[PDB]
């Protein structure tokens, strides 16, 4: 279950980026996904704060931090790409009008 969740968050990050969803919709999704795993962990063991479960929580934290970091950079790249394309499109019309 832990391995599946770790990959699921990262895979969902780019899917949300491609659709132009706002950060709030990503944050609510992240919280909802984390809550289910945390609740499920309550039956698959006592979650007693010993070394193994502490390490489990430590991994879970970074599993969220990494996706939260990548989500910003993906949009940062996309915005620059779109800006360059729009600036080229704006320059085409100037030559069109000059010729006309």
């Amino acid at each position: 279950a832990l391995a599946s969740f770790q990959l699921g968050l990262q895979n969902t990050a780019q899917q949300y980026v491609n659709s132009g969803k706002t950060p709030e919709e990503f944050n609510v999704h992240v919280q909802q996904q984390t809550n289910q795993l945390l609740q499920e962990a309550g039956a698959q063991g006592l979650n007693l704060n010993d070394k193994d479960w502490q390490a489990w929580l430590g991994s879970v934290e970074h599993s969220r931090n990494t996706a939260n970091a990548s989500y910003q950079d993906l949009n940062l790249k996309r915005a620059a790409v779109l800006q360059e394309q729009s600036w080229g499109a704006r320059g085409n019309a100037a030559i069109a009008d000059f010729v006309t």
């Binding site: 193994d52 390490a55 991994s59 970074h62 990494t66 970091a69 990548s70």
Partner: peptide, 22 residues
């Protein structure tokens, strides 16, 4: 891929420590 090595080191340590304490 995002230019953050510290997160990569933390990720490696998380798995190493998870394996160690089992």
């Amino acid at each position: 891929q995002s230019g953050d090595t510290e997160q990569a080191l933390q990720n490696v340590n998380s798995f190493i420590s998870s394996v160690t304490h089992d």
